[PDB]
Amino acid sequence: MFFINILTLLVPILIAMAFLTLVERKILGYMQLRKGPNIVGPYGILQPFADAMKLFMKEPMRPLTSMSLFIIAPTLSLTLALSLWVPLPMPHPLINLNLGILFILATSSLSVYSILWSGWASNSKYSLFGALRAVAQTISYEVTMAIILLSVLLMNGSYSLQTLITTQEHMWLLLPAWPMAMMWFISTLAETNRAPFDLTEGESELVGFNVEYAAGPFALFFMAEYTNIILMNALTTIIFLGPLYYINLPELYSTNFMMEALLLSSTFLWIRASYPRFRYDQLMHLLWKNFLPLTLALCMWHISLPIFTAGVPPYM
């Protein structure tokens, strides 16, 4: 069985990963007064499969570059992103890990390399400049991203994502800790290099590791980004928006997980069309000046709220 449970939890996500690009190229469209892709297939459903086939067929030109730090980089990007769905606790998880959130934080951190490796591998100026800035904001955002989680955990009692289903049986962790949700949401927008924070794929700025990447390598990161886009949104939908859990019927948890994840996934699509991209330093100015002092202080408030409100969370 366990193998079947690996197909499910993977394929299903990959098929959904494909349908996100479509729901991105249509929701951005209607917002901009245009139908979006509906001519290939019925209502554009076959559109994601179509360019996948075009991308894999086109030549994966190997620049006149490393040949490993070039092929390791997309493999690592897809491997880490699809891997981080392993411990996610939809209803009950596939591989329940006692230190689950540390797994998610650590696996995310490893993806910054793929950007570093791809940028060095390309051996063209646009790629290296883009990678150095890209690596900078990713790890810069990781620092507040991690502290925001530590505040959460201390009110959950453990690192296991499964505990929050029991922590959020009466109220979402948004009500409490909303100030961090926002700061988790903005950090989730940075770590998936989506729009407000997307200077990496900044086109007007550095047309950038993906610059020399075409066809199959382009696709793998590509796939990775979008799967992440979902995963991080899904982590928002478990950690802060806690879907109702009934032990008797486990799927209403997954049904609402489905609904909240899609809406917050819809939100970063909506954010992209709505906002201009921030400047490189304007981006780091936010995290180190605007958010890190807020996060570190609210981190202390979350070590104090438990103690003097005699609410220290139950381990286990």
The residues that touch ligand 3PE, with contacts defined as CB under 6 A, are 79-80, 83, 97-98, 103, 107, 289, 293, 296-297
Q: Which is nearer to ligand UQ9, 203 or 251 (CB)?
A: 203
Residues 44 to 103 in contact with another protein, rule: CB under 8 A: 44-45, 56-60, 71, 74-76, 78-79, 82-83, 85-86, 90-98, 102
What is the per-residue burial (b if ≥16 Cβ within 10 Å, else e) of 126-142?
A: bbbebbebbbebbebbb
Amino acid at 148: I
User: Shortest gap between Cβ of 14 and ligand UQ9 (angstroms)?
Assistant: 3
Residues 286 to 305 in contact with ligand UQ9, rule: CB under 6 A: none
Distances (CA, A) of 30 to 38, 47, 189, 270, 272: 12, 17, 22, 11, 14
**Residue 67 binds: one of ligand 3PE, another protein, ligand UQ9, none (C-beta under 5 to 8 A by kind):** none
Task: Give the sign of the dihedral formed by CA 236, CA 238, CA 243, CA 244.
Answer: negative
Residues 215 to 254 in contact with ligand UQ9, rule: CB under 6 A: 219, 222-223
Amino acid at 29: G
Using CB under 6 A, which of 36, 44, 48, 202 touches ligand UQ9? 48
**Residue 312 binds: one of ligand 3PE, another protein, ligand UQ9, none (C-beta under 5 to 8 A by kind):** another protein
Using CB under 6 A, which of 16, 40, 52, 258 touches ligand UQ9? 52
Binding mask 79-118 for ligand UQ9 (x = CB under 6 A): ----------------------------------------
Token pair listed for 77: 């990007």
How many Cα atoms within 13 Å fall on the side-chain side of residue 295? 26
Q: Could you give the CA distance from residue 169 to residue 175 in angstroms, rounded to a whole number?
A: 13
26 C-beta neighbours (distance < 10 Å), count: 19
How many Cα atoms within 13 Å fall on the side-chain side of residue 140? 23
- Note the residues at the interface with ligand UQ9 (CB under 6 A): 11, 14-15, 17-18, 21, 25, 48, 51-52, 55, 201, 203, 219, 222-223
